[PDB]
Write a protein of this length. Structure first.
Lengths: 205, 205, 205, 205, 205, 205, 205, 205
C-alpha cells in the first residue's frame, strides 16, 4: 500500500476531487484542551492514503482545511464525535457534512454490542486489521513504518463500510434517522468542546 | 385559575391563535407502547389552561393535532423527549418546532444538578408549585379537582420560563447550541419510539 | 375494631363460611428455616379480624389448616410469596387458590414504583395505616394492644383492595395474566422453600 | 449432516409426525418489537435438521404454525422465554406445551453457575459445539454454509438433553417443580411481549 | 444521675466488687494506631457511672487495668470489637471474659437489620437515649457537662440489656453459639490490631 | 454586619494592611474553563467583609491581584483547591502562601467524615451559618441582599477557624504535615487547570 | 497413585492410626440443606488416598464418623468452613480438632490475594494440580477414573502444606492467632448451618 | 548480568559515587506496619545491580542509609510512594531528593491508562521484562537465582527511563509540575505512615 507522508499540509488537492473522503486523526490523548493533534489521515477510497504530520502549535493547514470546509464532499469518520472536536479545536473549522460508521453500526448491527472498527471490518469485509498493542508517541519527529501503516489502516476501509451501511440503512428503513443523527453530530462535538463532554444533554438525569 | 376540561379534543382553536403554546401530557406510565395517553394540557400563557381528557383507544383529535402540526407555533415542553414520543405514538404526528425547558436549564443553569420543573419554577419565578405525593389513576372517567389543578399547574408557567431561558441563552451566547438541540429533539423522541430508548446514540460505549 | 385473639387455632369456622379470606402472618424473620411463625391473622372482610398466636414447635392447627386447604375459598395476601412459604413450612399445607395484591399492583399501578401496602391503601382507599417504627418480639407470650392492632390492620383492607384491583385488571385487559401469575405463585413459594429463594428461575442470568 | 433449507414454511409435516420437536430461532436482535424473526430451525431428533428462512413482513407459515399449535407435540427449546416471545409476536400463536433445557439445567445442575448450551452439551454429551465468534446478518437473502451449519447445531442435540434432564429431574425428585415452571413459561414470554421484559414479576422489589 | 469524673484512673475499686461491669470508650477516631484513647466509662449497673479522662501518652491505669484483667468479672460492651482493640493497644491488657450486646442482638433480634445501641435500647427498654449530633473533641482538657452525660449514657443500660439478651438466647437455644462468639471476640480484636482489620478471616474471598 | 459591595476591584488596600486575609469566590459552576468568576469575597477577620462583583470578560483587578500576590499575607480558604484554580484562570496570578481549613479539618477532626464549612463552624465556634437552599444566578447585574449576606458569611469566620486549627495541629504534632500540604496546594490547583482535575496524581491506579 | 474407592464407609481404620488425616468432600452444590454429600476423600499423608462414595439418604458411616470424632487426630482441610458444615449436616458429628490451609494462607501468605489450593500447591511445593474445567455429576453411581483422580488430588498434599504453614506461622509469630481461629472454625460452620451463612457475625454492619 | 547479593548492608559506597541511584524494595506485603522489608535493590545505571538481603528486626544499614540521606544523589523509584514509606518505617530516614517514573508516566504518557513498569519499559525501550507469575517468600534465608534476577530487573532500567521522561517533560513543558510533585512525594509517603494511606488528602470528598 502506497502511503504518502507529509508535514503540515497536503501539497494540493489533486488527489481529492471526489465526493467523499475518509478522515481520521491521532492525538496525544482524549482531551482536546490538553492533548494536541499529531497526525491527520485521508483517503480517496482507493488503495492509497495520505498521512499528514501536524507540528506543535500549528494553527493553519489551508489545503486540508479547504477540504474539510467543502460542503460537496462528505467526510467519513469512525466515531467522528472525537475527530470533529479535535479538528475544530485545532484549525477552527467544524465540518458539517459527515458520515459516522459507529452511529451507522449502532443503527443497523442491532444483533451485537461490539461496534469498534476492528469488529466491523472483520464482519462486513472479512478484512483483518491488526491493531498495535503497545501505544506510542505520535508526536515523535519521525514516525516509524509500523506507525505509518497502522495510521493508514484506519482510513483505507471507510468507503466500503459506508457503502455497506447505506445498503443496510435502506433495507431496514432508517435512512432519515441516520441523516438526522449525522446532521446533529457536529453540534454534539461542539458541545464537547464547550464543556459538556461528560453529559448526555438529552437524558432525564 | 380557570381550567376548562374537555373530552377528546378542543371544541375549536379560538383561544390558540398565538405564537407559542405550552404542552404537557399525563399517561399511565413511562413506556409508550404499554401505557396509554390519558390527559393533554395546553396553555396560551395567560392565567388559564385547557385540560383534555383522552379516551382509551382514541386515534384522532383533529383540532389538537392541527395545533401540534402548525409550524408557526412553538410547542413548549418540560422534558419534551417524553411528551413528543407519546403524542406521536398516539396521534401519529410528530411536532417539529419545539422548545424544552429542561435542555435550556442544562445549558444555562450550570451551577446546579437539579433541573426538575419544581426547582426551576422556584428559582426563576419564586412560584411554589406543590406536587402531589400520592400518584393516581389518570385514566379515571372523572378526574378530581385536585388532579385537574395539578395537571394545569404543569403548563401555567412554561411561557415565563421560556422568556427567561431565552434571556439566559443570549447572555451566555448559547443560542445556536440550543437551537440545534431543539431541532434534533423530535428525532431523539422518534428514536425512543423505534427501540433505542435506553441508548445514548452518540456515546462511545 | 373488634379483634379476637386466640392461642393455637380458631375455635371453629363459624365466622369463615365465605368465598374469600384475608390472610397475613408474622414471624421472627425472613428465613423460614430459621425464623418460626408467631402470629396468623384472618379477616372475613368485615370490620373484625382474628389474631391467632402460634406456639413454638406447634405442628397442627386443624381449623386454620382446613380453611387454608378449602379450594372454594380464595386466600388474599399482600406479597403472598412469603406467607405461603412460611405457612407450608409450618403446617405442611400449601394453599393453591390465592390472590396477591402486590402482583396485582405491579400489573395495574404501572405509574409508580412503590407497591407496598401502605402506599396502596393510601392511594386506593384514602385510608391511613400507621406502621409501627420500632420492631418487636412477636414471640412474646402476651402481645401488647398496639401489636394486636397493628397485626389486625394488615388484613382489614385486603378485600376492598381485591375488588378494586379486579376492576383495574378488567379495565386494562390483564385478567388472564394475573390469573396465570396467581396460579404459579404457590410453586414460586415452594421453590423458595426448596433452596432457590435468591434465584429468578426464569432469568437469562 | 443433512440440513434442508426452506423459504417461508415447511412444504409439509411428513417428517414431523413425532412426539417432540426441537425448536430454535434467529433474529436481528433481542427486542421483538424492533428486531424481526429471520430463521426458524426444527429437528425430529434424528441426525437431520430443517432450516426455514423467514421473509421480511411474513405473517403466516401454516405448516410451521400448525406444528407449533399441536398440543400433542412438546416443543423443546433452550431458553424458550425468548423464542416463545418472538414466535408469538411474529405468527400470533403461543405454544403451550414446552420444555426448556435452561430451566432444567438450573433445576438440576446446581453445582455450576454456567447454564449456556455449549457448556451443557459439553458436560452431558461430550459433544463440542463450536459457536461462531463473529456475528452475522441473518436477514441476508442467501445464508452461507457456515451460517446454515451453525443454525442447525442449535437444534441437533435438544432431544438427547431432554432425555438426560428428565432422568436428573426424576432422580432429584423435582419433576413437579419443572412441570409447573414449564407450564408458566409461555405466560412469562407473553409478559415480556406486553412490556414487563425487564421486571421479575414475583420479586419483592 | 451521679457521674463521677476522674483523671487517669479510678481512686480504688470499692464500687466495683461486682460480677459484671459495663465498659465503653471514647477516642479521637476509628484507627487505634493513629487515634488515642481519651475517655473510659464504667458502670456497676446502678444509676451511677464513672467517667475516667485518659491523658495523652498515658501508659498505665493500675486500678482500671486490674478490673479489666479480673477473670471473675464479665466486661459488657456494645461492639466490643473496637473497645477491646483500643484498650489492649493503650494499656497492653486484653480482657478475656466479655459480653457484647451487638453480637447478642445479631443472634436474637433476627427480625431487623438495625443493631445500633439506640434502637436496641428503644425496643428492649423503651428508654430514649439522645445521641448528640455534632461531634466533639474528646481530648479537651475539660469535658463539658453535655459530653459527660452523653458518655455516661453509653454504659448506664448495658446490664439490663445483658439480662434481656440472656433471656432471649436461652429462649431461642443459642447460648452455646453466643458463648463461642464471645470467647473468640478478643482474638478478633487482636487480629484488628495486627493488621487484618479490613479482612473477614473466615470468608471464602 | 457591614458588607461593602464593589464592582471590579477594591478602591484601595487601606483595610488590608494585615497578616492574613480570608478569601472565597462564587462562580457559574465547577468548571473554570466554562464557568466564569462572578464574585470575590474578602475579610480582614473583623466583623466586616468586602464583596467584589466581577464583570464578564474582566481580565484585571490590580488592587485585588496585588493582595493575592503579596507573599507576606496568608490567604485563608475553605477548599482552596477550587478558588486557587478559578483565581489563577481569571487573573493569571496563583497565590503561593495559603491556608485551607478543609485540609486542616481532615488532618485534625479525625473523628468525623463531615468536613464542610457548616459543620466545622457549628462544632468549633457554635455559630450557625444558614446556607441558602435554592441556587442562584451569581452573574446577575444586581445581587440581592440575601445573596450579599450569604456571600459574606463564607469569609466572616475563616480567621477564627485558622486559629483553632493551628492550635489543634500543634496539639497533635501535625504542623509540618499541614505546612507541606499547604505548600503543595497551589500546584494541585494548577494541575486541575492543566487537565488532571479528575486524577489523583499520587494514586497507584 | 493408588486410590481405593469405597461405598458408604471405610472397611476399618487400619490405615488411619495416625496423628492427622487430610479430609475433603464433594457435593451437589454449595447449599448443605439442598445439595447432598456425594464423596468423602481421606489421606494418611502418604502417596495413597481413600475415596468413599456416599449413598443418597445415607445417615451413618460408623468408621468414618469414628475417625471424625477422634480428638487425638487433627483433621486437615482446605476451606474447612464448608466441609465441616456438610459433614455435620450429613452425619450429625462436628469435628472439633481441625487445621485449615486457607486460614493459614491468609495468615502467612500476606503478599498475595490468591489463596486457592492450586496457587498454594504451586508456590509452596512446585506441584501442578490440574483442576478439571467441566463440572460433573458427583452423584453418578459409577465415578469415572478422571473423577477419582481429581477427587484424590485434593487430599494428597494437605500434610505437606500443613508442615510448611506451621513453619511459617512459627517464623512470623502467629501461632496463637491461628490456634484461636482453628478453635473457632467449627462454630463458624455451625453458624452457617443455623442460618447465618451470608453474615459476618463480627462485622460492624 | 552481574548481580551482587549482600546481607544487611553494602560493604562500602565505592560503586555509588554517582549523581543518581535506582532504588526498589521487596517486602512481605503492602502494609508497612505488618509486612517487613526483606530486600533492597540498587543500581548505578550500568549493567550491574546490588541486591541487599535485610534481616528480620534489622534497624540499621549505615552505608545504605548514608546513600539514602545524601542530598546530592537523586533516588529513582517506580511508584516511590511505597518504597519511601517502607524505607522510612524500617530505617528511620526519609529520602528527600527523588524521581518517580510512575508520576512522570502519568504526566507524559497521557495516551494510555497503563502505567506499570512492564508497559513503560516495553514502550520506551523495547525491552521485555518478564515478571514472575507465582509469588514468593522474599523472607527466605537463601533467595533463588530466579528471585535474584527478578529483583535486579526492577532497577536495571530506571536511569534510561528517567532520561527519556525528562526529555518528554521538557517537550511538553511540564518540568515544574513534575518537580513540585516529586518535592511533595516524601510527605505523601509520610502521610501513608501516619494513617492516611487510604485517603486522598486533596479530594473534595
Amino acid at each position: 500500500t502506497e502511503i504518502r507522508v507529509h508535514q503540515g499540509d497536503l501539497p494540493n488537492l489533486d488527489n481529492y476531487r471526489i465526493d467523499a473522503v475518509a478522515v481520521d486523526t491521532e492525538t496525544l490523548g482524549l482531551q482536546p484542551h490538553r492533548d494536541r493533534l499529531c497526525v491527520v489521515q485521508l483517503s480517496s477510497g482507493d488503495g492509497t492514503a495520505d498521512v499528514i504530520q501536524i507540528a506543535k502549535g500549528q494553527k493553519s493547514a489551508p489545503n486540508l482545511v479547504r477540504l474539510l470546509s467543502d460542503r460537496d464532499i462528505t467526510k467519513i469518520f469512525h466515531f467522528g464525535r472525537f475527530d470533529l472536536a479535535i479538528l475544530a479545536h485545532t484549525f477552527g473549522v467544524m465540518p458539517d457534512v459527515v458520515f459516522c460508521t459507529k452511529i451507522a453500526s449502532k443503527l443497523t448491527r442491532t444483533y451485537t454490542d461490539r461496534h469498534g472498527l476492528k469488529e466491523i471490518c472483520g464482519e462486513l469485509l472479512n478484512v483483518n486489521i491488526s491493531k498495535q498493542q503497545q501505544s506510542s508517541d505520535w508526536a515523535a519527529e519521525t514516525l516509524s513504518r509500523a506507525q505509518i501503516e497502522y495510521a493508514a489502516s484506519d482510513v483505507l476501509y471507510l468507503h466500503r463500510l459506508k457503502d455497506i451501511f447505506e445498503e443496510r440503512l435502506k433495507r431496514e428503513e432508517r435512512e432519515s434517522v441516520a441523516k438526522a443523527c449525522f446532521q446533529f453530530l457536529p453540534m454534539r462535538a461542539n458541545l464537547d468542546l464547550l464543556g459538556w463532554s461528560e453529559i448526555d444533554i438529552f437524558a432525564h438525569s
